[PDB]
Amino acid sequence: KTVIYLLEDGYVDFVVEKIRTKMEKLLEEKDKIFVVLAGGRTPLPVYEKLAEQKFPWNRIHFFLSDERYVPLDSDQSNFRNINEVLFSRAKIPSGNVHYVDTSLPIEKACEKYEREIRSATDQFDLAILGMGPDGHVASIFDLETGNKDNLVTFTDPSGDPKVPRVTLTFRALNTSLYVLFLIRGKEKINRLTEILKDTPLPAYFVRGKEKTVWFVGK
Numbered sequence: 001k002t003v004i005y006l007l008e009d010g011y012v013d014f015v016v017e018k019i020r021t022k023m024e025k026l027l028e029e030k031d032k033i034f035v036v037l038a039g040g041r042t043p044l045p046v047y048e049k050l051a052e053q054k055f056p057w058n059r060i061h062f063f064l065s066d067e068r069y070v071p072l073d074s075d076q077s078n079f080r081n082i083n084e085v086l087f088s089r090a091k092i093p094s095g096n097v098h099y100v101d102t103s104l105p106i107e108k109a110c111e112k113y114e115r116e117i118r119s120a121t122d123q124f125d126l127a128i129l130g131m132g133p134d135g136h137v138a139s140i141f142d143l144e145t146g147n148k149d150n151l152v153t154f155t156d157p158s159g160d161p162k163v164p165r166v167t168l169t170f171r172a173l174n175t176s177l178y179v180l181f182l183i184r185g186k187e188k189i190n191r192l193t194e195i196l197k198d199t200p201l202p203a204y205f206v207r208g209k210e211k212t213v214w215f216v217g218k
Contacts, residue, residue: 001211001212002207002211002212002213002214003211003212003213003214004192004213004214004216005018005213005214005215005216006216007215007216007217011184011215011217012045012046012049013049014215015046015182015215016046016049016050016053018180018213018215019046019050019126019128019180020050020053022126022178023035023055023060023126024055026125026126027055027056027059027060030125031059032059032060032061033059033060033061033125033126034061034063034120034121034123034124034125034126035060035061035062035063035124035125035126035127035128036062036063036064036065036124036126036127036128036129036168036173036176037062037063037064037065037082037086037128038064038065038066038078038128038129038130038137038138039064039065039066039078039081039082039130040078040130040132041130042130042182042183042184043128043129043130043182044081044082044085045085046128046182047082047085047086048085048086048089050086050090051085051086051089051090052089052090055090057090057091057092057093057096058092058093058096060092060096061096061097061098061120061121062086062087062092062096062097062098063098063099063117063120063124063168064078064079064082064098064099064100065127065129065137065138065139065167065168065173066078066100066138066139066140066165066166066167066168067079067099067100067102067109067139067165067166067167068102068139068161068163068165069102069106069109069154069163069164069165069166070102070161070163071102071103072099072101072102072103076161076163077102078099079099079100098113098116098117098120099113100113100166101113102166106154106164106166107154109154109166110150110152110153110154110166111152113152113166114150114151114152117151117152117172118151122175123175123176123177124172124173124175124176124177125176125177125178126176126177126178126179126180127173127176127178127179127180127206127208128180128182129173129179129180129181129182129203129206130181130182130183131181131183131188131191131192131203132159132188133187133188133191134191134201135191135194135195135199135201135202135203135204136159136201136202136203137173137181137202137203137206138167138168138173138202138206139155139158139159139165139166139167140167140169140170140202141155141158141159141165141202142155142158142202143200143202143205145167145169146169146170146202146205146206147169147170148169148171149169149171150169150171151168151169151171151172152166152167152168152169152172153166153167153169154166154167155167170205170206173206174205174206174207174209175209176208176209177208177209177210177211178208178210178211178212178213179206179207179208179211179212179213180213180214180215181203181212181213181214181215182215183214183215183216183217184216184217184218185217185218186218188216189216189218191203192214192216
C-alpha cells in the first residue's frame with residue numbers, strides 16, 4: 001500500500017523519527033541493512049539529523065540513488081553533499097558507503113557501481129528519495145531511463161544542473177522493501193496529486209515491495 005503523511009510543522013523531526021524507528025526495526029531482524037539515499041534540498045537536512053542518532057553504523061550500508069557526472073568535490077555532487085551531512089559526520093565504515101566513481105568514463109562508472117551493488121545485496125531495505133518539481137526521481141527524468149534493463153544506467157545532459165547523470169533504474173529502486181519520498185511545498189504537492197490520478201511521472205513507478213510512504217511538508 002501507499003501511506004501519505006501531510007505535515008504542517010516539525011517536518012524534519014517527524015521524518016527523522018519515522019526513519020529512525022524503521023531502521024531500528026530492520027536492525028532487530030537483520031545483521032546488516034542496505035539503504036539507498038537521494039541527494040537534494042529536502043533529504044539533506046534529514047540526513048544531517050540522522051547522522052546524530054546512536055546507530056550501530058557498521059551494520060548500515062549506504063548507496064546513492066544517483067549522481068551528477070561531475071567531479072566528486074563539486075558542490076553539484078550528491079556524494080559531496082551527503083558526505084558533508086552524513087558520511088563524514090557519523091562514524092560509518094568506509095567500506096559501507098557506496099557511490100558513483102565519476103572519475104571513470106560514464107559507462108564504466110555505471111558498470112562499476114552496478115557490480116558493487118550486486119556484490120553488497122540483492123535487495124535494498126530502505127530507499128530515501130526526493131522528487132523534483134517535474135515529478136522526476138533519482139536522476140530518472142524520462143521513462144526510457146527508468147525502464148532500462150540494468151540496475152544502473154546513465155542519461156544525456158538532463159535536469160538542473162543540465163549534466164549527464166548516473167542513476168539507479170526503476171528495477172533497482174523497486175527491489176527496496178520500503179520506499180520513502182520526502183517532498184515539500186505546493187508544486188511538489190501538485191505533482192503528487194497528479195501521481196494519485198495515475199499520471200506517469202517517473203516517481204509514479206517507484207514503489208516499495210512492502211510499502212511506499214510520502215512525507216509531505218507545507
